[PDB]
Amino acid sequence: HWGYGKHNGPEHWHKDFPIAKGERQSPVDIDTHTAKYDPSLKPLSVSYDQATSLRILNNGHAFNVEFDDSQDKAVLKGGPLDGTYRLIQFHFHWGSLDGQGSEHTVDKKKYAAELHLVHWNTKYGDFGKAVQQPDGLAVLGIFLKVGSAKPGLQKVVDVLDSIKTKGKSADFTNFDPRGLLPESLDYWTYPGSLTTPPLLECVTWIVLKEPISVSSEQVLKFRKLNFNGEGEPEELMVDNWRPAQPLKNRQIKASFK
Ligand SMILES: [Hg+2]
Ligand SMILES: [Zn+2]
């Protein structure tokens, strides 16, 4: 099926998923001199105090930290969003080298990795229904650069050994996503899509300007993951990012200036 290699990668996705060439595809390049400050943006509200993680899963493309979304707990609201969006999972995209890995780019700059915290609009009852709606999802995107270690990421790093291959999962309770947030909540926002098939055009993107710094040894451990299933030829899980897609006259707004 779809992947990131030469024969099943982003350039092939359009065949099974025609929407790959659609009008609001993600990621995009954020041209900082074209994005306009928007005075009508409300303050962004990230409320992760009562977040309840359940488990971590290697799905053969990335790893997802999944949350219990059966109650209103970890929610994103404010900014460009109307109503309340519930955290369901987070995952990352990363490179084989520090000079690449992010999906969004900033004035064509690629970061070492990108964190996606995926939330669904609670007016639609659940995730599956939300992804049938143009405002069904909100994704908080956070860039990763290589420098000082991120202490709040280490619990994730340490569990990766138990989920090396496609299909493996581990109990992952009491993880606090607040340990993954940078100081500032300044952001760019635009309407877009999921960056993995089925590439559904249901996302309000909120991409934070301030990256988090992770250590070289932290990202190195990301790179020890496998795309393949256990007992199969080893294919390192690296470069699981989709490159920037056409903006198509969409408007990127900034929360700051
Ligand atoms: Hg949609
Ligand atoms: Zn993602």
UniProtKB/Swiss-Prot annotation:
Entry's Gene Ontology BP terms: angiotensin-activated signaling pathway; carbon dioxide transport; morphogenesis of an epithelium; neuron cellular homeostasis; positive regulation of cellular pH reduction; positive regulation of dipeptide transmembrane transport; positive regulation of synaptic transmission, GABAergic; regulation of chloride transport
Effect of L194A: Reduced CO(2) hydrase activity
Catalytic activity: hydrogencarbonate + H(+) = CO2 + H2O; urea = cyanamide + H2O
Effect of N59T: Reduced activity
Reported regulation of activity: Activated by X-ray, histamine, L-adrenaline, L- and D-phenylalanine, L- and D-histidine, L-His-OMe and beta-Ala-His (carnosine).
Signal peptide interval: none
Annotated binding of substrate, by residue: T195, T196
Name of the featured protein: Carbonic anhydrase 2
Species per Swiss-Prot/TrEMBL record: Homo sapiens (Human)
Lineage: Eukaryota, Metazoa, Chordata, Craniata, Vertebrata
Gene: CA2
